Amino acid sequence: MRTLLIRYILWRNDNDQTYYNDDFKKLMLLDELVDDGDVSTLIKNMRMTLSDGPLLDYLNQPVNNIEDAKRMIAISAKVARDIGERSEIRWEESFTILFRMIETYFDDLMIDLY
Amino acid sequence: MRTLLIRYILWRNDNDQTYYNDDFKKLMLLDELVDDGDVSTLIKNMRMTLSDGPLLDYLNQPVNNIEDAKRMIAISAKVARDIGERSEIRWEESFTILFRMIETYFDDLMIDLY
């Protein structure tokens, strides 16, 4: 799940067809769980501060169930998409927090998606 | 370079043909810079300790030139290959250190390889 999510989020950022996989189809379905307004806000703040700061703050919120975990994946993916490839983001810092919060749900998320 | 190296190292770990790209061909050439004995030792220690600890210790060594930077990429790649996909490694912790050391050489590494 760690490798899959890294690959997915990075592909959402750059849109390189050579790095696409059908495994992503099921993960892209998680987008319905997230309100486009929350993403829009997060992007505005990231641009206002010229940093990944607002994203790292979003990812630090508690994850109490599988639905919270799915929303975190979706928010990261939608943010990656909407921020653009030119954005100088140390993605590994975001993955560190994301996986710290969602790690436990990996087994169940895999079952849920596939 | 950050995205490319993440993608390369993860592909070296699982050998998933669906996640392969021809950009990796030039990076795989860096393997000649690394002695297989150093990798063998690193793997032995990682298994002895049941941790990525030895790898994170290797990556914390100073990088004084582009050749040091290339050796770090090659050691990470050969370790990723030899440790196996089943290995529960928090890859983002390794990428954090690797990129902290090699970040500056990215522009020059890109020129050197492509």
Residue numbers in the entry:
A (entry chain E), B (entry chain B): 1 to 114
Quote the authors verbatim.
VACV protein N1 is an intracellular virulence factor that is expressed early during infection and modulates innate immunity by at least two strategies: preventing apoptosis and inhibiting NF-κB activation. The VACV Bcl-2-like proteins N1, B14 and A52 all form dimers via a common surface comprising alpha helices 1 and 6 (the ‘1–6 face’). Biochemical and structural analysis of these mutants demonstrates that the anti-apoptotic activity of N1 relies on a hydrophobic groove on the surface of the protein and that the anti-NF-κB activity requires an intact dimer interface.
By analogy with VACV proteins A52 and B14, which have the surface groove filled by bulky amino acid residues and do not inhibit apoptosis, we introduced the bulky residue tyrosine at positions R58, Q61 and R71 in an attempt to ‘fill’ the N1 groove and thereby exclude BH3-peptide binding. To determine if the point mutations introduced in N1 generated unanticipated structural changes, R58Y, Q61Y and R71Y N1 were expressed in bacteria, purified to homogeneity and their structures determined at 3.0–3.1 Å resolution. All three mutants crystallized in the same space group as wild-type N1 and the overall structures of all three closely resembled the wild-type protein (0.21–0.39 Å r.m.s. deviation over 108 Cα atoms). While WT N1 and the groove-filling mutants (R58Y, Q61Y, R71Y) were all dimeric, the I6E mutant was almost exclusively monomeric. Introduction of the groove-filling mutations R58Y and Q61Y abolished the ability of N1 to prevent apoptosis, while mutants R71Y and I6E inhibited STS-induced apoptosis as strongly as WT N1. Investigation of N1 mutant R58Y binding to Bid and Bad was unsuccessful because this mutant bound strongly to all proteins examined, including both pro-apoptotic and anti-apoptotic Bcl-2 proteins and tubulin, for unknown reasons (data not shown). Expression of WT N1 decreased NF-κB activation significantly, as did expression of the groove mutants. However, infection with vN1.R58Y or vN1.R71Y induced lesions that were indistinguishable from vN1.WT.
